[PDB]
Ligand binder design. Structure first.
Ligand SMILES: *NCCc1c[nH]c2ccc(O)cc12
Lengths: 304, 7
């Protein structure tokens, strides 16, 4: 079986390249971040523009939802993160401590902590309520491309241009594991699987890999797309068929069968690199976002 | 930002 993703909506509004798109856990909203220094909120089902959230002084590389869909955290070249109350648009906290661009961010499952990665080669853990930095991990020897908490928040995974994925104990800050395969390309993205058993890692040699991080073993390789330059997000699609989803530098969205690793669909329509994709939590809906020559977000829907 | 950032 293969999906039948078809283009339903194209979302115009950002004035520069879009950097990240994320569906709210409650399925109601899509959040987008951009090099235009703005966050935009859109209806998840109709793509209807809701509002603009502003305040960063420079471009934004990432945005992430709290698990109750009430807050966003954003990571900016202005070297801050900002915590936003989505309903009011208010900047609750500005998180200051990184010494270079902030590239990536996430809440933990119980949304009392934020994790961030930076061009300063550190991973930082922040208290959501106080907005204060709790820990600085000297994590990598090159910019940190992605950070993610596991299912219970006890672990953080980080990836870096240094070629490593590292697993950190949230409580102690101890490095518990370093993962690398037989070559050492920059690692451009990582996240834990929905069941928390695997990490999905992108490297800038046109490759996605599914790792059992506790065994330290590469279980699956996904290839066929183009990824040698940009930090492109990748997703687990779990609402219908079990897919891997990624953007690509050939301006397509790629969809793989997770088990078989075969390409099952390519989505055409963007006019520039697809930097970010997101999968809706309950409906078979993909959001995709593209770089400076395109500036749009597309919503795609499948029967399976 | 991510939108032009390379290694
Ligand atoms: N993405 C900008 C180019 C690059 C690559 N590695 C880096 C480390 C530090 C820094 O300020 C820029 C940079």
């Amino acid at each position: 079986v293969k999906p039948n993703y078809a283009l339903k909506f194209t979302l115009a509004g950002h004035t520069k390249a879009v950097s990240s798109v994320k569906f709210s856990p409650n399925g109601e909203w899509l959040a987008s971040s951009s090099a235009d220094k703005l966050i935009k909120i859109w209806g998840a089902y109709d793509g209807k523009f809701e509002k603009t959230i502003s305040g960063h002084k420079l471009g934004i590389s990432d945005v992430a939802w709290s698990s109750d869909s009430n807050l966003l955290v954003s990571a900016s070249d202005d070297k801050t993160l900002k915590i936003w109350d989505v309903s009011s648009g208010k900047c609750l906290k500005t998180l200051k401590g990184h010494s270079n661009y902030v590239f990536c961010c996430n809440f933990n499952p119980q949304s009392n902590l934020i994790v961030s990665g930076s061009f300063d080669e550190s991973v930082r853990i922040w208290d959501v309520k106080t907005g204060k930095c709790l820990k600085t991990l000297p994590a990598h020897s090159d910019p940190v491309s992605a950070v993610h908490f596991n299912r219970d928040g006890s672990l953080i995974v980080s990836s870096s241009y240094d070629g490593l994925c590292r697993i950190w104990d949230t409580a102690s800050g101890q490095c518990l594991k370093t993962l690398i395969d037989d070559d050492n390309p920059p690692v451009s993205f990582v996240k834990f699987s929905p069941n928390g058993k695997y990490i999905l890692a992108a490297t800038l040699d046109n490759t996605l890999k599914l790792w059992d991080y506790s065994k330290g073993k590469c279980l699956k390789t996904y290839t066929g797309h183009k990824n040698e330059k940009y930090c492109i997000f990748a997703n687990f699609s779990v609402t219908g068929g079990k897919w891997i989803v990624s953007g690509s530098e050939d301006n397509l969205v790629y969809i793989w069968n997770l088990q078989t690793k075969e390409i099952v669909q390519k989505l055409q329509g963007h006019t520039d690199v697809v930097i970010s994709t997101a999968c809706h939590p309950t409906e078979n809906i993909i959001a995709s976002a593209a770089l400076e020559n395109d500036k749009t977000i597309k919503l795609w829907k499948s029967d399976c | 930002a991510r939108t032009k950032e390379t290694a």
